């Protein structure tokens, strides 16, 4: 066909039906297209309506909550291809919650360059089992058709003939009066005409002539003035990779939407700039970037308050915010994960930040890209940040894996009795608020109350590594008053990378990724230590220790807290190779496929595979037919506040009684074939007998040169199929008639084994009479080296002999002619 109509910007048609028919004259609906909220229409106002001009939708086809529609053939049947740089819920054909819909129309839809087909929450939708979504799209994994009435076998379907092309399901038809033309698989990317031939290598989808892109609509090549043109002559830009529109028209569409404004990218007038691009403001060219780069984010009224994980899923695909933000999230389990996912990419906050009434935070790790705060919004009093009502906050983001710089305002930390002043001083300089010579308003009398961050380090005296246990030891530490020592808290976690610290994982209520063990104080000397309870060999773990002491009336700790170290378990024997699967694909070849060891514990140098011949069974020759921690069991289990409170109260009570007593008591003076494969998960056995079993073993060895330490041998049995090349009876069929009219037979057994010959069927025919079949058992065969007939009548007989091996029936021998005499 052709496009003689106009080009119209996308229209969000909702709650009416007047703007819809406006698209009757328009041939190219540039931009989005939303068809939803129509509950005033009825299924009696349509009888089949088609628009000549409209041939293409360019962003997405959306159908949501549409009533009074019986089929998709009442709007327009000329839809050919749905493509563009924009998508609605990542689908090209959205059919969601439609009612009275019982058929799908169109007769030109055969290819979709980009997109998917969603058909969900339907209640009368039928006609989806006659046409397959394999030659109507360019993807075979982007079809989601669920919750319909034709998936439970309740929808009937009838199509012309048992006609509709084909090269309840009968034919390939959309409706009962509209066939679906499946294109021949000789082109595979250019669709086909209603005639049934595939279009040229420049066309796509429906065409009006085969091998004639001039009359083609919706083509891989570009379209201009009425034909598919391979190239776009400048300034003509590649509009959706289907047409050419001069720079002027491109920027005119862009400005008009100011509806998915169209920009210039790779000479294409596409309205979307892929990930990693930025707006070059000379022609608004999407120029590439490294990592995320600035992009405007239209926050509602220049402000977006977040107080829940759901209220934070709107910050994705955003790099430079427009306005300020507020944080009030409380509770929640493993908040840092969703936080870093939803907004980890935010590099700059244009406005201020608020931590008012924040809860369920122990460490801030939500931001890694944040490096600059513009500060266009400031809380009255020249403040660029607020923090308050935080009594679980222990530390901020790490300062050697992150960078932040402020340009205006004063810091503010009030009512944070758990954040020590050290971090505050750190941020005084790093924040870039004390490098401007301006006094900030920060409270130090309401922060750090009954809390501190004063700690020392521990030195591991000895460490013994094993492949299932890691013993640790360290110097005996003691607080100023030995009695204050309450023990140690060995904290450990599995480190896959050498970047595991207390800032990764946890930091939120309901989740913790650092297992904790406890150690009793040392003798008042022996070095305090701990030995693991078993672990995975060849695994790297992050570990550190912390000290527990009796807190004074001010809760000042004198403990020592070692730094995080990384200890990898020792190499052990390789694990068993998972899933040994050998498949006999011929009579002499077998292909094996397996998975590598469950745990390598090194590097697999080579695999060792043995095999031996398994002869044919004997019975066959004799038988003739003629939260993030473990919580399923606790023997050491996580600690709670009550535990610490109680143990400290009891320690203090004991010490009080002891000092009391002492003061009272003291007052001052008055072989087998094998093969080896290196860094390969497949083996091919060459030269094996047909119909012969083979017991194949499979091992793996993490170390081969120092020692031959390997995994257990997994076994498998493979019975090759029997050959089927020589089943026919060989040698001449010797027929010997004697004085008694006994026609003894001397036929030879097939040369090729082909398994085993369970029997020899004979089919003779008396001239002018009915045939006769006879089964010759192996025993009788060997006894006679053929067979033997007793009682032949005068006249000629036709005899056919078909051997029967394990490769199925052979082929009947030709009729031997012997005129039996009397």
């Amino acid at each position: 066909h052709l496009y003689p109509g106009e080009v119209c910007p996308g229209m969000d048609i909702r709650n009416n039906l007047t703007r819809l028919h406006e698209l009757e004259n328009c041939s190219v609906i540039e931009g989005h297209l939303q068809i939803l909220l129509m509950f005033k229409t009825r299924p009696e106002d349509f009888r089949d309506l088609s628009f000549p001009k409209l041939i293409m939708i360019t962003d997405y086809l959306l159908l949501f909550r549409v009533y009074g529609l019986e089929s998709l053939k009442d709007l327009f049947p000329n839809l050919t291809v749905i493509r563009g740089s924009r998508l609605f819920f990542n689908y090209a054909l959205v059919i969601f919650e439609m009612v009275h819909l019982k058929e799908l129309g169109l007769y030109n839809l055969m290819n979709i360059t980009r997109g998917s087909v969603r058909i969900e929450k339907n209640n009368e939708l039928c006609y989806l089992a006659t046409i397959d979504w394999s030659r109507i799209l360019d993807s075979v994994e982007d079809n989601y058709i669920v919750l319909n009435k034709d998936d439970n076998e309740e929808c009937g379907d009838i199509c012309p003939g048992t006609n509709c092309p084909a090269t309840q399901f009968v034919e390939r038809c959309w409706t009962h009066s509209h066939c679906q033309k499946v294109c021949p698989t000789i082109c595979k990317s250019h669709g086909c005409t209603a005639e049934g031939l595939c279009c040229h290598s420049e066309c796509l989808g429906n065409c009006s002539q085969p091998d004639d892109p001039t009359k083609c609509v919706a083509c891989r090549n570009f379209y201009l003035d009425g034909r598919c043109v391979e190239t776009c002559p400048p300034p003509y830009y590649h509009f959706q990779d289907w047409r050419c529109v001069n720079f002027s028209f491109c920027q005119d569409l862009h400005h008009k939407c100011k509806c998915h404004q169209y920009v210039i990218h790779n000479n294409k007038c596409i309205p979307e700039c892929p990930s990693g691009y930025t707006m070059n403001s000379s022609n608004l060219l999407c120029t590439p970037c490294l990592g995320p780069c600035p992009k405007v984010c239209h926050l509602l009224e220049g402000e977006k308050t977040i107080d829940s994980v759901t209220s934070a899923q709107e910050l994705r695909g955003c790099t430079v915010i427009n306005g300020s933000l507020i944080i009030n999230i409380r509770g929640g389990n493993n908040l840092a994960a969703e936080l870093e996912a939803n907004l980890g990419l935010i590099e700059e906050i244009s406005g201020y930040l608020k931590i008012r009434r924040s809860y369920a935070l122990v460490s801030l790790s939500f931001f890694r890209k944040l490096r600059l705060i513009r500060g266009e919004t400031l809380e009255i009093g020249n403040y660029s940040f607020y923090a308050l009502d935080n009594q679980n906050l222990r530390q901020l983001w790490d300062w050697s894996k992150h960078n932040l710089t402020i340009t205006q305002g004063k810091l503010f930390f009030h009512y944070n009795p758990k954040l020590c002043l050290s971090e505050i001083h750190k941020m005084e300089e790093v924040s870039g608020t004390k490098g401007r010579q301006e006094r900030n308003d920060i409270a130090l009398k309401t922060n750090g109350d009954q809390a501190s961050c004063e700690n020392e380090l521990l030195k591991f005296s000895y460490i013994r590594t094993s492949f299932d246990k890691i013993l640790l030891r360290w110097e005996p530490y003691w607080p100023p008053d030995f009695r204050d020592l309450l023990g140690f808290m060995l904290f450990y976690k599995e480190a896959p990378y050498q970047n595991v610290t207390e800032f990764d994982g946890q930091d939120a209520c309901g989740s913790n990724s650092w297992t904790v063990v406890d150690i009793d104080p040392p003798l008042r000397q022996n070095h305090p230590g701990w030995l693991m309870r078993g672990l995975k060999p060849w695994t790297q773990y992050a570990i550190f220790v912390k000290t527990l002491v009796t807190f004074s009336d001010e809760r000042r700790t004198y403990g020592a807290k070692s730094d995080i170290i990384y200890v990898q378990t020792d190499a052990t024997n390789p694990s068993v190779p998972l899933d040994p699967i050998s498949v006999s694909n011929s009579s002499s070849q077998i292909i094996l496929k397996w998975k590598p060891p469950s745990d390598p514990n090194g590097n697999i140098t080579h695999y060792l595979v043995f095999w031996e011949r398994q002869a044919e069974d004997s019975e066959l020759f004799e038988l003739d037919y003629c939260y993030e921690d473990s919580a399923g069991e606790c023997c050491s289990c996580p600690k709670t506040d009550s535990q610490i409170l109680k143990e400290l109260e009891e320690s203090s009570f004991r010490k009080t009684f002891e000092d009391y007593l002492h003061n009272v008591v003291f007052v001052p003076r008055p072989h087998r074939p094998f093969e080896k494969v290196v860094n390969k998960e497949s083996l091919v056995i060459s030269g094996l007998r047909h119909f012969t079993g083979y017991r194949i073993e499979l091992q793996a060895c993490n170390q081969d040169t120092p020692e031959e330490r390997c995994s257990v041998a997994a076994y498998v049995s493979a019975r090759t199929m029997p050959e089927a090349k020589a089943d026919d009876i060989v040698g001449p069929v010797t027929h010997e008639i004697f004085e008694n009219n006994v026609v003894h037979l001397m036929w030879q057994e097939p040369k090729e084994p082909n398994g085993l010959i369970v029997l020899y069927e004979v089919s003779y025919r008396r001239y002018g009479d009915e045939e006769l079949h006879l089964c010759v058992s192996r025993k009788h065969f060997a006894l006679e080296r053929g067979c033997r007939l007793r009682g032949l009548s005068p006249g000629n007989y036709s005899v056919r002999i078909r051997a029967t091996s394990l490769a199925g029936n052979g082929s009947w021998t030709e009729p031997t002619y012997f005129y039996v005499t009397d």
Binding site: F482, R483, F666, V667, P668
Partner: peptide, 25 residues
């Protein structure tokens, strides 16, 4: 630092005296 208190003080005291008797009330 270490501070002589509790059993540590008792042991660090018995060598000073305790073979001539302790303080008497």
């Amino acid at each position: 630092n270490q501070h002589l208190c509790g059993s540590h003080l008792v042991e660090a005291l018995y060598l000073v005296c305790g073979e001539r008797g302790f303080f008497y009330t």
